[PDB]
Amino acid sequence: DGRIFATDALEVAITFVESLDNRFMTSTASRLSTVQREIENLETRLNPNPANRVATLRRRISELERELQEAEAGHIEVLETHQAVEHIRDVYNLASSLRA
Amino acid sequence: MEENTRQRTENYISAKNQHPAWILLATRRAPLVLSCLKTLFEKSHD
């Protein structure tokens, strides 16, 4: 139509060039918690046995109840300055990965 | 087995000589074209 459109090769080259400069680290404490969470979620959602799923759901509910009970005492834990920065960067990386 | 080491080199050579991304990167004018294209496509995708 007389217009130019980018392809996957151009996107790959642009990604390489952009990653040449300073780029966000993925070898971080966060995105380790993320992979652990995703692995546990996949393990729960992949099992065919319903009893195992029920037991895992009950255990998660128990842990959430314990956390809520602790919070009721006022034990809500802010993460950190640097920890918050790292989590924000991790989330930004994960979100940016959605358009590849 | 060195096959994983010779077919790998063949694949790398083929990609270097054929894949548009590596061809553009190796081109001695790559920075100018890359900057122009990135600037053009940063604003519009239609």
Side-chain angles (χ1 to χ4, degrees):
Chain A
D1 157 43
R3 333 254 289 291
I4 43 156
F5 299 82
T7 80
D8 185 66
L10 173 59
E11 291 306 349
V12 166
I14 286 170
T15 287
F16 164 84
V17 162
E18 280 184 287
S19 97
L20 261 181
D21 88 323
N22 212 327
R23 99 192 157 274
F24 285 164
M25 217 167 337
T26 77
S27 167
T28 76
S30 40
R31 185 180 292 273
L32 177 51
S33 324
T34 309
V35 202
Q36 283 159 359
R37 287 194 266 283
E38 287 307 42
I39 275 191
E40 281 311 9
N41 177 352
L42 193 73
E43 256 146 41
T44 80
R45 185 258 144 182
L46 220 163
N47 68 340
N49 191 348
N52 288 61
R53 284 215 45 172
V54 174
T56 315
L57 201 36
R58 310 335 162 181
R59 209 177 40 257
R60 270 151 78 197
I61 302 153
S62 96
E63 300 306 76
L64 192 271
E65 207 287 89
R66 164 202 287 75
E67 287 148 48
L68 174 33
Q69 144 211 292
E70 264 153 72
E72 290 154 339
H75 312 335
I76 87 157
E77 184 41 309
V78 308
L79 291 150
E80 251 305 341
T81 73
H82 68 81
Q83 286 187 244
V85 175
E86 149 186 337
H87 274 65
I88 287 155
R89 289 177 159 157
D90 178 324
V91 152
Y92 170 70
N93 189 293
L94 281 189
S96 312
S97 99
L98 272 175
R99 49 201 316 310
Chain B
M1 50 297 270
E2 66 89 33
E3 300 330 283
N4 70 279
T5 81
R6 214 132 187 111
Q7 65 95 63
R8 152 177 285 152
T9 296
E10 188 313 311
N11 293 328
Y12 280 20
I13 286 151
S14 96
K16 154 67 168 282
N17 302 122
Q18 293 189 233
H19 194 242
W22 205 339
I23 287 167
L24 167 61
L25 253 49
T27 207
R28 259 183 105 259
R29 209 173 329 190
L32 305 318
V33 184
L34 263 180
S35 36
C36 161
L37 295 175
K38 181 154 203 359
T39 305
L40 298 171
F41 291 124
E42 227 183 23
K43 75 172 177 324
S44 171
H45 293 125
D46 36 3

